[PDB]
């Protein structure tokens, strides 16, 4: 059944993936991004309108609170607009700290 | 082909 991403939704999910040894330390590509967007839709019927991040540079944080995965730095056309490398990493602080509007409040609206 | 081409992609992320 279809459904837009909610908090408890994204929340419970974030762990479900970590518990399945997913994403942690895996390298990012604009291709792999959509690869994720799709898993949620085919397996969990989640409207992929959710997955978004901060331009940066430096660390990239999710524009969907409750999401507990952040992009951290360490060519191709799915490469990085900031020429940096990015890999997924878990962080529970993002469940109680909207790092997004914290550091990049200007990227809303 | 549809469920496989989907799965092999999941693999890149440690799921499947």
> What does the radius of gyration of chain A's CA atoms come to, in whole angstroms?
13
Resolution in A: 3.7
DSSP E strands in A1-109: the ranges are 3-4, 46-47, 69-72, 87-90
CB A65 within 8 A of CB A103: no
Measured CA to CA, the distance from residue A16 to residue A19 in angstroms comes to 5
Report how this structure was experimentally obtained. Answer: X-ray
**Contact state of A26 with B15 under an 8 Å Cβ cutoff:** no
DSSP strand pairing (A69-72 vs A87-90): antiparallel
Query: A35 and B12: CB-CB below 8 Å?
Result: yes
Q: What does each C-alpha distance from A51 to A10, A76, B2, B4 come to in angstroms?
A: 10, 22, 23, 24
Can you read off the two tokens belonging to residue A99? 């790092």
Number of domains comprising chain A: 1
Of A87, A4, A84, A81, the closest CA to residue A45 belongs to A4
Domain extent, residue A50, equals 1-109
SS3 call for A109 = coil
Dihedral angle of Cα A47, B11, A62, A11, to the nearest 10 degrees: 70
Q: What angle do CA A45, A39, B9 make, to 5 degrees?
A: 155
State the CATH number of the domain containing residue A36: 3.30.62.10
- B11 in A contact zone (CB under 8 Å): no
Distance CA A4, CA B10 (A): 22
Q: Which chain B residues are within 8 Å of A40, Cβ to Cβ?
A: none
Q: Is the dihedral of CA A27, A32, A37, A41 positive or negative?
A: negative
Cβ <8 Å between A32 and B10: no
Contact predicate A71/A59, CB 8 Å: yes
Distance of CA A20 to the CA centre of its chain: 16
Token representation of residue A27: 């390298």
Q: Which two tokens stand for residue A60?
A: 């990239």
Position of tokens 């890999």?
A: A87
């Amino acid at each position: 059944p279809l459904r837009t991403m909610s908090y408890k939704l994204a929340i419970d999910m974030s762990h479900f993936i970590k518990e399945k040894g997913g994403l942690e330390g895996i390298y990012y590509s604009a291709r792999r991004h959509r690869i994720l967007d799709i898993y949620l839709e085919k397996e969990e019927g989640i409207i992929p309108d959710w997955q978004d991040y901060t331009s940066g540079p430096g660390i990239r944080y999710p524009k969907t609170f409750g999401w507990l995965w952040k992009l951290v730095p360490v060519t191709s056309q799915w490469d990085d607009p900031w020429g940096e490398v990015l890999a997924w990493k878990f962080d529970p602080t993002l469940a109680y700290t909207y790092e997004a509007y914290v550091r990049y409040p200007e990227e809303f609206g | 082909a549809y469920q496989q081409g989907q799965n092999q992609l999941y693999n890149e992320l440690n799921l499947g």
